[PDB]
Amino acid sequence: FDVGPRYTNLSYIGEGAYGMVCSAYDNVNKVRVAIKKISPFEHQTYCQRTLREIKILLRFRHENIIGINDIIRAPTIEQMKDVYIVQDLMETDLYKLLKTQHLSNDHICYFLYQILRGLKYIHSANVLHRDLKPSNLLLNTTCDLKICDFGLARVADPDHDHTGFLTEYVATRWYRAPEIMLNSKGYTKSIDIWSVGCILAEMLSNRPIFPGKHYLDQLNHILGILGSPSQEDLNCIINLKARNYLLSLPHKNKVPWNRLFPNADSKALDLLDKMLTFNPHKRIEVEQALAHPYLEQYYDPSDEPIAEAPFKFPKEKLKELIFEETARFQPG
Ligand SMILES: Cn1nccc1Nc1nccc(-c2cc3c(s2)C(C)(C)N(CCN2CCOCC2)C3=O)n1
Numbered sequence: 071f072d073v074g075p076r077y078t079n080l081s082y083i084g085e086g087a088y089g090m091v092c093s094a095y096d097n098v099n100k101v102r103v104a105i106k107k108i109s110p111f112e113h114q115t116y117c118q119r120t121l122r123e124i125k126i127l128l129r130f131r132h133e134n135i136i137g138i139n140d141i142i143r144a145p146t147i148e149q150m151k152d153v154y155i156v157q158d159l160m161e162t163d164l165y166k167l168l169k170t171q172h173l174s175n176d177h178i179c180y181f182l183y184q185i186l187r188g189l190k191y192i193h194s195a196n197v198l199h200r201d202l203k204p205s206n207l208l209l210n211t212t213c214d215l216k217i218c219d220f221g222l223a224r225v226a227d228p229d230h231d232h233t234g235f236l237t238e239y240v241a242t243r244w245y246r247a248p249e250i251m252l253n254s255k256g257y258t259k260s261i262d263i264w265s266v267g268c269i270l271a272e273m274l275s276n277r278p279i280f281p282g283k284h285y286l287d288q289l290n291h292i293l294g295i296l297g298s299p300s301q302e303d304l305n306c307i308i309n310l311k312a313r314n315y316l317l318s319l320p321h322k323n324k325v326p327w328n329r330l331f332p333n334a335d336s337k338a339l340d341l342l343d344k345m346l347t348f349n350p351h352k353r354i355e356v357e358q359a360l361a362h363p364y365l366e367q368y369y370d371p372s373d374e375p376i377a378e379a380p381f382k383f384p385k386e387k388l389k390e391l392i393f394e395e396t397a398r399f400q401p402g
Contacts, residue, residue: 071107071141071155088116093159096139100398103139104159105112109152110392119221120153124395126197126220132375134188136160136208136218141399147389153396160208160216164269168204168276175335177213178273182338183360183368184215185266190356192217193259194376196226200256202243202265204272225383227257235311236285237282241290244278249350252368254310259348264357267345274331274338290319296348303349337364 071080077094089108096103110116127138140156146342162183167173173181185207192199199206203224208216216271222241233255239246241256247264250256271279279295282288293299298321307313327339341362344354354362 071105071154072152073105073156076140077103077105077142077156088113088120090273096156102108102159104157105142106155106157108155111151111385114388117385117392121388121392121395122223123220124155124392126223126381128395129379129381130195130377132188132190133193133214134184134192134216136216139179141396143393143396143400145400146394150389150393153392157218158216161211162209163205164207164209164215164273165203165205167209168272169255172276175338178270178338179335179364180213181207181215181273181369182266182270182341183365185217185269186356186360186365186373188215188217189262189266190360190374191377193226193262193356194380196380196382197223198226198256198259199223199262199265201245201260202269203242203245204269207269224257225381227255227383231255231257232309235309235315238285243282243285244280246288247350248289248292248348251286252316253307253309254350258350259355260353263345263353263356264350266359267342270338270342270345271331274334274342278329292348293319293322295325295330296346297322301350303352306349306351334366337362340364372386 073094076097078097079095081093082107083093083104083209088110089103089106091106094103094105110120110122124138127136134364136157138155138157142154142156143152144150199217199220201219202217206217206219208218233253235252237255239250239256245265245268247254247261268279278286280291282291298319301315304313304316307316327342331339341359341364345359347353360374
């Protein structure tokens with residue numbers, strides 16, 4: 071971990087496929103920080119995702135979205151093998167927290183509020199995160215929450231969202247909206263809302279709500295709780311392979327949320343229901359979720375900011391863009 075004299079005394083924290091996140095002590099400001107060693111320069115896709123994330127986190131400024139404090143890299147493209155991204159150290163993440171801690175209703179409420187407040191800003195930028203999950207939600211010692219990991223994020227593209235049945239998808243399986251498996255590329259804001267719905271359900275029980283073990287088992291987990299889709303919702307799936315697959319399944323009845331979650335607040339289950347709607351057109355949006363009765367103690371739209379400037383949208387060209395996009399952190 072080659073992070074210069076600014077970042078002394080290191081540790082051992084998190085990991086990815088094309089990089090790794092750990093911890094060290096900062097000297098220009100006098101605090102411990104998080105640092106992630108990214109080495110993506112062998113693959114086009116991973117270069118694209120290092121670049122997506124850098125460009126987004128540098129444009130974004132919001133209290134519930136992780137920032138970049140520094141980027142450490144070689145002075146020349148030639149000498150640049152690794153990129154080190156420095157961020158505020160966060161005590162934990164919601165994944166780690168859910169495996170060890172019962173959350174009070176008051177924590178659940180506050181966490182959901184902050185996730186939606188961060189997500190309001192993201193979506194106001196015309197950006198989709200596309201991989202929200204407990205391990206991408208960071209928490210400090212006083213339960214302040216920041217959204218991290220924008221490597222699968224995209225500019226929204228609802229006019230190009232349609233695809234065939236069983237189209238491969240990249241984002242984490244347990245948090246995938248049912249339409250992903252049926253007819254959606256995940257190019258609409260509704261995809262993030264479904265994930266948030268899943269995270270909420272998981273905060274209520276400490277257990278993932280739809281833990282599918284493979285691509286199509288994911289859908290059948292979803293339908294086991296929501297029940298069979300209605301005729302109207304089925305008529306919105308025009309793709310015949312997808313429609314006929316749903317028609318081939320035995321009828322399933324809705325599992326009521328209060329049987330699944332008998333200790334949960336009844337307003338939290340009302341919001342859950344609206345986040346985990348099968349039909350993405352009927353699914354609650356982020357600003358309506360913030361306005362829901364469950365969040366009324368926190369709701370303040372003048373204190374839930376939006377982005378000033380939204381977005382509009384090979385490996386050798388991408389290294390040069392990564393080089394150009396990290397130039398501001400260099401000495402000189
Ligand atoms: C102590 N503690 N415990 C939990 C979380 C933390 N503190 C903490 N503070 C600040 C930032 C972070 C993280 C950032 C990122 C994290 S944690 C992950 C989720 C690993 N990630 C993706 C990495 N990519 C995946 C694809 O290949 C390339 C690498 C980040 O960008 N964490």
